[PDB]
Design a binder for this molecule. Structure first.
Ligand code: ICS
Ligand code: CLF
Ligand SMILES: [Fe+3]
Ligand SMILES: [Fe+3]
Lengths: 477, 522, 522
């Protein structure tokens, strides 16, 4: 569509809101212009959601527990508060790991205090101490405990800092108290920030004086990759095939030892800027470790990222990077030859959280498809700044989009594919538009790396060209 | 490496040699993992009985619970009314979690909204959030009624839902005649079934407490049915079909099957079917009100008897032979309509399926968990099949329900080795199935981890999971099955016998070792 | 040794040490068994490509056939009429085998009778056997009519059924007005479906051929449905339900529905339901006749198009979306009744389930076998589900059906890797699944041996068996399922997707080895 038509569609969609809601939502919809380098002049981000408009955003408890701390496998994470949250967030995110669940790994488990009315009225400090004692009694092989605070804990002023400090000192254990109450902030981003602050204060500086770890000039840490079906492993195999040594993974398949060993690395490879930029900046300022953004979504982005990473080291690393690129070229070339004809010219609309709306555009372009509209759940203005460059002319940008807005935007655009979460999958499937879950990879994956590119292409081809989408109209209607 | 003609997903791609070598290198170099012998020792200890005593001595830690919070049930109850928008007063993360939960269980769109209450709203109150949210929801999604629930954050600070809604109506944010029923659903009290009960009671109060002057019992010659927290569309369908076959006028309140089974024909329907407002306004005029799941409909029962003057029958859930016949007989007595020949033929066919499968169903030891009414109905049905329940678990049960289940068990010789647990979680159940091993487990998708643990101990200690309950995430379209009535009994019996036969076939597939019992006819 | 608390059946009683030692002593002493390495070598050779070439070079030996003989289908067709006793002219062992087969498949009593022909009948004939059997059957079991079919013995010695029955009526053995339709069912021609066709042809001819002078097409404003050889009760139920819901008067000929699902009420009912003689006599007055399985109703089609003067439509079996749609449109066009909105909603629900499960269903390779029409419908549904059938087998199929299936496979991109086999048995299918391994097998209970062989080769070579078809002996109450129409499509889709997910869960249950993909949500 033309630029004058996207604005008309935006106005027609906004016409249904009341005055306050319309005025607020007019600031969150924009027509892309890659020339503009400041996203503040076109879109407004990181504000509170309008009440009663069916937002897709989550809470700070999600952004901390289910995002940052949860993937850590050797730790035990306590959902301090009522049951719901832990139950709703149990095993819903596919942060893959290797370990014996119930013995030394606890990712898919749900530990909760299960607050009652008497806990609200009288407190939860004694109950928390008893819970820590029972956790240590029944799960002796855990390497740490984290306390994720749910809303009531923040409201009633339960002092989990002192309980954590006392129990950790007396039991010689690392107990990290996290104030990730849902009502804090507007979305999962503040949960990311709180979890990063907890990591900085209670975990990161534990080995500040230990010098037993021998460091090589090829030490790297993957920052912000959470192994959604093995993406972290796929990236790690490429990084290790380059001659680089990965010491830490944050936090998919990550261990507390990797977090402790991170300050000894020579370079931080940040995948998700939105979630771990604060900890990357803290490490850069305190230990002098530089950090850089890398993207392993599609062959072009992967090759560019490998070359940029190899540019940070000596000639042997560059030679190994060239060897890896040459080795992996025929496979992704064959994948393109197989799947691009079936996917050429197709239009894609995306609505994901903080990073993936701009990171996956490269793969779609590698497969011959174009992105006609992308959007962020909770991303800040810097993410949109990076997003304007990657998106073409006259493409719609939306922040904190509502179900109504997304429904009519899709109705007016008629995209060939929609990539969003589980809360819009069936809405758009019943509309006759192929849908792909861009958070869990539709229980497939991994999609990062050369190995993940083939799975990505196969999944897009099977979802887009399925015979079921041509059968939604009865022959007699 | 990937071959384009045969692409591998995570399994079995990460079983390749390069990925295995990299995993081992990462582990040994940086994971600082405990030695494998220590891990095996700890697992074996966790499978023992001393660990069971330590686990059952728990007082403050809950591991893998089998329950949810009240607003989930409140939303499920609100979804059953015509053009009704479930509104949750509180934080948006709760609504997101509810929608994800119901999307995963039903594979259907689930409409729910929130006022997105923040820290300033937690300190100054949620009056402005309530006003703006009601106005915006009505303007945007245009529902005929908004049902308000609460999150724990609002309940702790004591939000006055009645005063907030009254002020919202008084300042013109909503029309004064627009129906906005509300209910208090504290998440630290009870569970999701309590939330369903609270929401239904609130809606019933809203449409019927101020207009009881012109109501007479039996005026409309109908029977009200309250289904409670139900996640099987087949139950609603079978109740309606049975009551239509008996020729009995019925008003099933809070019927959500239409909005949870919308067709895929090119358009998205936010609202479909549901109990109408006229049906609830005319509810007191019915001859009687029947509760399908009485053990979590206590407040509703109290309100109905106190206000509608309906003598609610003391009926169990229509699960199994005896209870389905009791339900049908009570309905026939209330309405005067005799039980027709079709239901008799269905009962005879079900008894003939029981007779056919009794040789394989007898003596089987079962561990089960779930909702109180559902668990007690399953236990009763297992008792009529000759099966032996061993571990009965209900995380949201109380002492009275436990006493009722104990009486049911003592009424039968197959309940001799059966113990009932209330307030326990699935870690306790794992300890139980490791110490006192049953043949099978009946529960929701959370028991697959218990099955994994039992398999890790050994093939002879494996306890297979039979998926009957809520929520089921790892299987598709199981929410379309039936649990209540004769049809549900046939479905459950077929599932159980086929699970037993599948396990037997798996155990006897070894050639020249165990295939002497790989019989063609079973 | 047996422990009273834990009494063991054959498995795992024979896995005990004493029984193991006894069996080892027997084998090493008096069996002259081949060495185990030789057995392993022979098995591995039988799993090879050269063994497949030798297996497909067969033209004189049949190993594990996938079909039965004509009198079985004749008996099944005769059981579908009101108070009709299936009479079999020949040997009693054939009747015993038929009753055992149908008792094992249906878990219900089956009534069939024989004249008990012996070598004396081979010397002379079966005239006296015919007369005595007819008289005894009429006296004892009081049938409304007797349908006569022949075994291979009666057809080899060339018995003349018409003359025998006319003589029996002439000499007072049976009343002259007693209806005794007959049909020739040679067991060396065709299969059970041919016997069903022949029996229905004989009954229709008996009731209509001589009384076509007062018949006018469309007088009764009804449509006739001939279901063919069917062993799924839900198929009859769904056809009746859809036709009644469309508002179409229908005359469903040869309904064995009620006699195969008799309720348990303390008494035995030999007869139940079935097509009435008035319906059979009034059939020529219908608007048209619809054959649900046209590929084994050729004789019936010839008769109804030549005698009844009905323009029978060229319809495929109503299996799957497209063919159910075409069947519904043809029924609507013949009857003039529009398609109801509820059927449209059911189709939309089927499409919704398809959209939900397409991700798991896509790319899966299936090897299937069974009757021609059922196999073709299954292939069509798999092609609409994004699955690739690879090994399509039909022992009782012909070249025209193979050409039609080839056209269907050419119509879809997912039929590129398919190959259709006719006149091949399950040993050929075993060779095929060893050579070109499919993900799953769809068929009757006879594929469990193939699954056992594949498991013996290795776990990663195992091809699980999905039990759809006839006969099913190792599972209970699968005969109550449905395969026709939208409801049967949903049931088949659910079975397929749940089998796939169960296999994935089985392959991901290993701790620290493959449990990274043991996802709670699928
Ligand atoms: S952490 Fe974030 S919503 Fe950066 S909360 Fe969310 S596993 Fe999304 S776009 Mo789900 S900021 Fe990760 C994300 Fe991106 S859970 Fe995953 S897919 S790259
Ligand atoms: S915004 Fe987030 S998810 Fe909401 S409560 Fe707060 S931390 Fe948790 Fe928890 S038990 Fe249920 S789901 Fe809530 S109502 Fe409370
Ligand atoms: Fe759906
Ligand atoms: Fe039976």
């Amino acid at each position: 569509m033309s630029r004058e038509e996207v604005e008309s569609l935006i106005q027609e969609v906004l016409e249904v809101y009341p005055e306050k809601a319309r005025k607020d939502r007019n600031k969150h919809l924009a027509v892309n212009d890659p020339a503009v380098t400041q996203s503040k002049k076109c879109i407004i981000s990181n504000k509170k959601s309008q009440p009663g408009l069916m937002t897709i955003r989550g809470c700070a408890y999600a952004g901390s527990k289910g995002v940052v701390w949860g993937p850590i496998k050797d730790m035990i994470h306590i959902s301090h508060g009522p049951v719901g949250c832990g139950q709703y967030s149990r095993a819903g995110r596919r942060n893959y790991y290797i370990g014996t669940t119930g013995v030394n790994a606890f990712v898919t488990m749900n530990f909760t205090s299960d607050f009652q009315e008497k806990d609200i009225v009288f407190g939860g400090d004694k109950k928390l101490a008893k819970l820590i004692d029972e956790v240590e009694t029944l799960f002796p092989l855990n390497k740490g405990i984290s306390v994720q605070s749910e809303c009531p804990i923040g409201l009633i002023g339960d002092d989990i800092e002192s309980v954590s400090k006392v129990k950790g000192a007396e039991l010689s254990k690392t107990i990290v108290p996290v104030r990730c109450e849902g009502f804090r902030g507007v979305s999962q981003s503040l949960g990311h920030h709180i979890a990063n602050d907890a990591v900085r204060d209670w975990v990161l500086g534990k080995r500040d004086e230990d010098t037993t770890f021998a460091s090589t000039p090829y030490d790297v840490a993957i920052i912000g990759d959470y192994n959604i079906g093995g993406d972290a492993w796929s990236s790690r195999i490429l990084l290790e095939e380059m001659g680089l040594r990965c010491v830490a993974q944050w936090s998919g398949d990550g261990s507390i030892s990797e977090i402790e060993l991170t300050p000894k690395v020579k370079l931080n490879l940040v995948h998700c800027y939105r979630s771990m930029n604060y900890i990357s900046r803290h490490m850069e300022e305190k230990y002098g470790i530089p950090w850089m953004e890398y993207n392993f979504f599609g062959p072009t982005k992967t090759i560019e990222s490998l070359r940029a990473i190899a540019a940070k080291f000596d000639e042997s690393i560059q030679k190994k990077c060239e060897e890896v690129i040459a080795k992996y070229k025929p496979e992704w070339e064959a994948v393109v030859a197989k799947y691009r004809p079936r996917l050429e010219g197709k239009r894609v609309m995306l609505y994901i959280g903080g990073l993936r709306p701009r990171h996956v555009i490269g793969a779609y372009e590698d497969l011959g498809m174009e992105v006609v509209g992308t959007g962020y759940e909770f991303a800040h203005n810097d993410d949109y700044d990076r997003t304007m460059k990657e998106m073409g002319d006259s493409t719609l940008l939306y922040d904190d989009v509502t179900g109504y807005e997304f429904e009519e935007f899709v109705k007016r655009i008629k995209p060939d594919l929609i990539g969003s979460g589980i809360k819009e999958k069936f809405i758009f499937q019943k509309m006759g538009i192929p849908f792909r879950e861009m958070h869990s990879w539709d229980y497939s994956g991994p999609y990062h790396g050369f190995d993940g590119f083939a799975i990505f292409a196969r999944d897009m081809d099977m979802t887009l060209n399925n015979p079921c989408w041509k059968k939604l109209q009865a022959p007699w209607e | 490496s990937q071959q384009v003609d045969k692409i591998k997903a995570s399994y079995p791609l990460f079983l390749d040699q390069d990925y295995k070598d990299m995993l081992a290198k990462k582990r040994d170099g940086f994971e600082e993992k405990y030695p494998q012998d220590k891990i095996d020792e700890v697992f074996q200890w966790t499978t023992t009985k001393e660990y069971q005593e330590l686990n059952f001595q728990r007082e403050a830690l809950t591991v893998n619970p089998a329950k949810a919070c009240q607003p989930l049930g409140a939303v499920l109850c609100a979804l059953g009314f015509e053009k009704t928008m479930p509104y949750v007063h509180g934080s948006q993360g709760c609504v997101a979690y509810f929608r994800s939960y119901f999307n995963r269980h039903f594979r259907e769109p689930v409409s729910c909204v929130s006022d997105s209450m923040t820290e300033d709203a937690a300190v100054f109150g949620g009056q402005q959030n309530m006003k703006d949210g009601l106005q915006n929801c009505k303007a945007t999604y245009k529902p005929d009624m908004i049902a308000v629930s609460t999150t724990c954050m609002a309940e702790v600070i004591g939000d006055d839902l009645n005063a907030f809604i009254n002020n919202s109506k008084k300042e013109g944010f909503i029309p004064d005649e627009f129906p906005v029923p509300f209910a208090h659903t504290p998440s630290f009290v009870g569970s999701h079934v309590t939330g369903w009960d609270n929401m239904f009671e609130g809606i019933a109060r809203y449409f019927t407490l101020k207009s009881m002057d012109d109501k007479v019992v039996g005026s409309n010659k109908k029977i009200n049915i309250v289904p409670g927290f139900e996640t099987y569309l087949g139950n609603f369908r079978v109740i309606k079909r049975m009551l239509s076959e008996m020729g009995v006028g019925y008003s099933l309140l809070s019927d959500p099957e239409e909005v949870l089974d919308t067709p895929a024909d090119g358009q998205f329907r936010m609202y479909a079917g549901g109990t109408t407002q006229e049906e609830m306004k005319d509810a007191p005029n019915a001859l009687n009100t029947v509760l399908l799941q009485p053990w979590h409909l206590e407040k509703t029962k109290k309100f109905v008897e106190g206000t509608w003057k309906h003598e609610v029958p003391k009926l169990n859930i229509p699960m199994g032979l005896d209870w389905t016949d009791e339900f049908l007989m009570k309905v026939s007595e209330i309405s005067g309509q005799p039980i027709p020949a079709s239901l008799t033929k269905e009962r005879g066919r079900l008894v003939d399926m029981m007779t056919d499968s009794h040789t394989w169903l007898h003596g089987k030891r079962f561990a089960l968990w779930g909702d109180p009414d559902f668990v007690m109905g399953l236990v009763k049905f297992l008792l009529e099949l000759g099966c032996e329940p061993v571990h009965i678990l209900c995380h949201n049960g109380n002492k009275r329900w436990k006493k009722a289940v104990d009486a049911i068990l003592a009424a039968s010789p197959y309940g001799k080795n059966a113990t009932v647990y209330i307030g326990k979680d699935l870690w306790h159940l794992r300890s139980l199935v490791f110490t006192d091993k049953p043949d099978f487990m009946i529960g929701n998708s959370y028991g697959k981890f218990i099955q994994r643990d039992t398999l890790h101990k050994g093939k002879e200690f494996e306890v297979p999971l039979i998926r009957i309950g809520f929520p089921i995430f790892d299987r598709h379209h199981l929410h379309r099955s039936t649990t209540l009535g004769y049809e549900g009994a046939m479905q459950i019996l077929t599932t159980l016998v086929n699970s037993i036969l599948e396990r037997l076939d798996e155990e006897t597939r070894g050639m020249q070792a165990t295939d002497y019992n790989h019989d063609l006819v079973r």
